[PDB]
C-alpha cells in the first residue's frame, strides 16, 4: 500500500546540532555531549542532544533525588533492608502520609514525619523545574506556553498534596508515595466522598482528558495524512500557508462543518490539555472542603439517574439456576 509515514525508512546522520544561540549565551551551561540513537530515530529524531543544565535544573534534579532517596530509603527500611523483599514489594510499599490525628502539625518521623520532609524536597524540585521551563523560554526568546501549561499540571499537583491538606486542616489528606498506594488513595478518595464520578469537575476534567487524547489522535493523524505536503513543518505552514494546511482544514470542514488553522489547532491542543488538571484541581479542592458527598450532591441537584428494577440476584435468577443445577 501507500507509505504511511509511521516509521522513517531511511535515516541520515550528520554533525550534531548543538542548538541556536543569542546574546543570552545558552552555550555556557550546555553539556556539549551528544549521542545518536538509531532505534529512537525510526519514529523520531535520533540525536540525544546536549541538555542545558542551569541552577533551576540542578536544584530540581538534586532535590528530586532527595525526595526519591528519602522515599526509597524509608521503603527499604520498611522491609527491614531486605533487598529481595524490597524488590518484591516495590509496587506495594510507599511513604504513607501522616496520621490524621496530627492535623497540620509536624508528625513523628516514622508516622509521616519523613513524608513531610520528602514532600518538601519534592515541592522544591517541581517548582524549580517549572522555573527552568520559564527561564529557558525567556532565554530562548519564545513564548511561555510550556511554562504556563506546566503550571496547570502543577495546579493539580499542588492541590492534591499542598492546598487541599491545608484547607482540610490535616496533612493526612496528601497522596502516598507509592505505585499501588496512590491508586488505593485514588479509589479510597472516590469512595470516602460519595462517588467522584458525580463530581461535575471530575466529569469536566474527563471531558478534556478524553478531548486531549481525541484531539491529539486527530491532530497526529491529520498531520501524518498531510505530511505528504510537508504538513509536519507546521511553523512554515503558519507563516506561509501551503496546501498541507488547506487540505487538513478542508478535510475537517467537509467532515464536521468547521476546522482550524495550522496555528489555531495548537490553541485547541494547548487549552484542552491545560483544562484537564485545572478542572481536576477545582474538583479536588471542592471535595471534602465543601461537599463531602458527591452522589448526594447529584441527587440534590437532580442529575443522578433513578432505577426502578429490583436489586437482588434473586429477582433475576436463582443460585441453583446460576450454578446450572
Amino acid at each position: 500500500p501507500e507509505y504511511q509515514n509511521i516509521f522513517t525508512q531511511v535515516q541520515v546522520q550528520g554533525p550534531a546540532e548543538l542548538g541556536v544561540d543569542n546574546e543570552n549565551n545558552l552555550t555556557e551551561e550546555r553539556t556539549t555531549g551528544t549521542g545518536f540513537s538509531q532505534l529512537i530515530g525510526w519514529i523520531g529524531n535520533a540525536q540525544l542532544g546536549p541538555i542545558y543544565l542551569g541552577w533551576f535544573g540542578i536544584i530540581s534534579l538534586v532535590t528530586g533525588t532527595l525526595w526519591f532517596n528519602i522515599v526509597g530509603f524509608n521503603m527499604l527500611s520498611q522491609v527491614g533492608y531486605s533487598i529481595p523483599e524490597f524488590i518484591r514489594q516495590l509496587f506495594w510499599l510507599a511513604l504513607e502520609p501522616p496520621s490524621p490525628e496530627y492535623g497540620l502539625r509536624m508528625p513523628p518521623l516514622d508516622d509521616g514525619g519523613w513524608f513531610i520532609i520528602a514532600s518538601f524536597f519534592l515541592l522544591v524540585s517541581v517548582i524549580s523545574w517549572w522555573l527552568r521551563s520559564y527561564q529557558l523560554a525567556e532565554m530562548h526568546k519564545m513564548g511561555k506556553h510550556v511554562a504556563w501549561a506546566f503550571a496547570a499540571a502543577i495546579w493539580l499537583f499542588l492541590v492534591l498534596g499542598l492546598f487541599r491538606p491545608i484547607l482540610m486542616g490535616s496533612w493526612s489528606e496528601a497522596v502516598p508515595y507509592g505505585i499501588f498506594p496512590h491508586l488505593d488513595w485514588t479509589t479510597a478518595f472516590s469512595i470516602r466522598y460519595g462517588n467522584l464520578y458525580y463530581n461535575p469537575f471530575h466529569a469536566l476534567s474527563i471531558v478534556f482528558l478524553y478531548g486531549s487524547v481525541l484531539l491529539f489522535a486527530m491532530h497526529g493523524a491529520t498531520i501524518l495524512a498531510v505530511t505528504r505536503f510537508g504538513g509536519d513543518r507546521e511553523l512554515e505552514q503558519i507563516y506561509d500557508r501551503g496546501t498541507a494546511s488547506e487540505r487538513a482544514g478542508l478535510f475537517w470542514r467537509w467532515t464536521m462543518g468547521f476546522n482550524a488553522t495550522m496555528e489555531g489547532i495548537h490553541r485547541w491542543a494547548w487549552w484542552f490539555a491545560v483544562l484537564t488538571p485545572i478542572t481536576g484541581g477545582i474538583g479536588i479542592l471542592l471535595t471534602g472542603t465543601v461537599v463531602d458527598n458527591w452522589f448526594l450532591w447529584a441527587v440534590e441537584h437532580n442529575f443522578a439517574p433513578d432505577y426502578t428494577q429490583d436489586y437482588g440476584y434473586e429477582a433475576y435468577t436463582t443460585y441453583d439456576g446460576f450454578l446450572g443445577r
Binding site: 531511511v10 550528520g14 510537508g230 500557508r241 496546501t243
Partner: protein, 256 residues
C-alpha cells in the same frame, strides 16, 4: 464552607457556573483564532457569500517573520490565492463538485492542486536554505535503513522510470525530504523530485504508486538543482498526490 448561597447553589455549584462562562468565552476565543485564514467564506461563483458564520473575524495579529522577510498579518488578503483555475461548475447552484477543464494534474486542481506560496527556499536558523542535497550537505550520511540512492524507481503501473541519483535532506532536522529521480530518456528528460512521504523504499527498488510511468515527464521541476523554493515544493508534492485520483479513470471512478 458547607452553606448554600441560595436554594442548593453552593460554592461547588458557583465554581461550575463560573467555568461555564469561561468555557463559553474560551470557545469563542478559540474559534475566532481559527478564522485567521480562509475567510470571508465566498461561494462557488467567487463572490462573497451572504452567510459568514456566527463568529466574527478576529482582530489582526502581526507576525514578525525572521530572516528579514517582513511582517505578516493573517486576517487580510491571502497571497496564497490561485487565479485562472482550470475548473468549471457542474451545476448552476452551490455545493456541487467542479469538473476540471483539462488535465487535472497539469492544471493543479483537486488532489493535484498547490498553493501560491513564497517563491523562496525555506531557511533554517543560520539563514541558508533548509533543504539541500546530500552532495551539498557536509558531514551527512546514511545511518540506518535502506539507502535509496542508485535504486530504480517503479511507478504505479510497474514501469521503471529511472533511478534515484540523490536525495534531499533537511540538515536542520537531519531528516530526508525528497529523492531525486534521474528520469530515463524513454520516460523523461532530467531530474524530478519526489517527497519521502509518497515513496516506499524496498531492498532493490523504490516504489511510488500514485504516479504512473507516463506522468513523470510532467512532474514540476526546480529552477536550481541546489535548492527548492516553497512554491516548487508545493507544486511538486501536490502533483504526486493528484495521481492518487487522476492516474487512471479507475481511481477516480467509485470502487464499488
Amino acid at each position: 464552607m458547607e452553606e448554600t448561597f441560595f436554594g442548593n447553589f453552593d460554592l461547588a455549584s458557583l465554581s461550575l457556573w463560573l467555568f461555564y462562562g469561561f468555557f463559553a468565552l474560551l470557545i469563542y476565543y478559540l474559534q475566532t483564532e481559527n478564522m485567521r485564514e480562509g475567510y470571508p467564506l465566498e461561494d462557488d461563483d467567487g463572490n462573497t457569500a451572504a452567510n459568514q458564520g456566527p463568529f466574527p473575524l478576529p482582530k489582526e495579529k502581526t507576525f514578525k517573520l525572521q530572516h528579514g522577510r517582513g511582517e505578516l498579518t493573517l486576517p487580510g488578503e491571502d497571497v496564497q490565492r490561485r487565479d485562472n483555475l482550470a475548473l468549471r461548475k457542474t451545476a448552476h447552484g452551490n455545493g456541487f463538485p467542479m469538473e476540471p477543464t483539462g488535465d487535472p494534474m497539469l492544471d493543479g486542481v483537486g488532489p493535484a492542486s498547490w498553493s501560491k506560496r513564497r517563491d523562496v527556499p525555506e531557511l533554517d536558523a543560520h539563514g541558508h536554505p533548509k533543504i539541500v542535497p546530500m552532495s551539498a550537505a557536509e558531514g551527512f550520511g546514511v545511518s540506518a535503513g535502506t539507502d535509496p540512492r542508485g535504486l530504480p524507481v517503479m511507478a504505479g503501473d510497474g514501469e521503471i522510470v529511472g533511478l534515484v541519483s540523490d536525495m534531499w535532506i533537511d540538515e536542520a532536522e537531519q531528516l530526508v525530504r525528497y529523492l531525486e529521480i534521474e528520469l530515463d530518456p524513454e520516460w523523461g528528460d532530467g531530474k524530478r523530485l519526489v517527497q519521502r512521504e509518497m515513496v516506499r523504499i524496498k531492498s532493490d527498488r523504490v516504489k511510488v504508486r500514485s504516479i504512473y510511468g507516463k506522468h513523470f515527464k510532467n512532474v514540476p521541476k526546480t529552477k536550481s538543482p541546489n535548492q527548492v523554493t516553497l512554491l516548487e515544493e508545493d507544486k511538486i508534492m501536490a502533483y504526486y498526490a493528484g495521481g492518487t485520483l487522476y492516474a487512471d479513470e479507475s481511481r477516480l471512478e467509485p470502487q464499488l
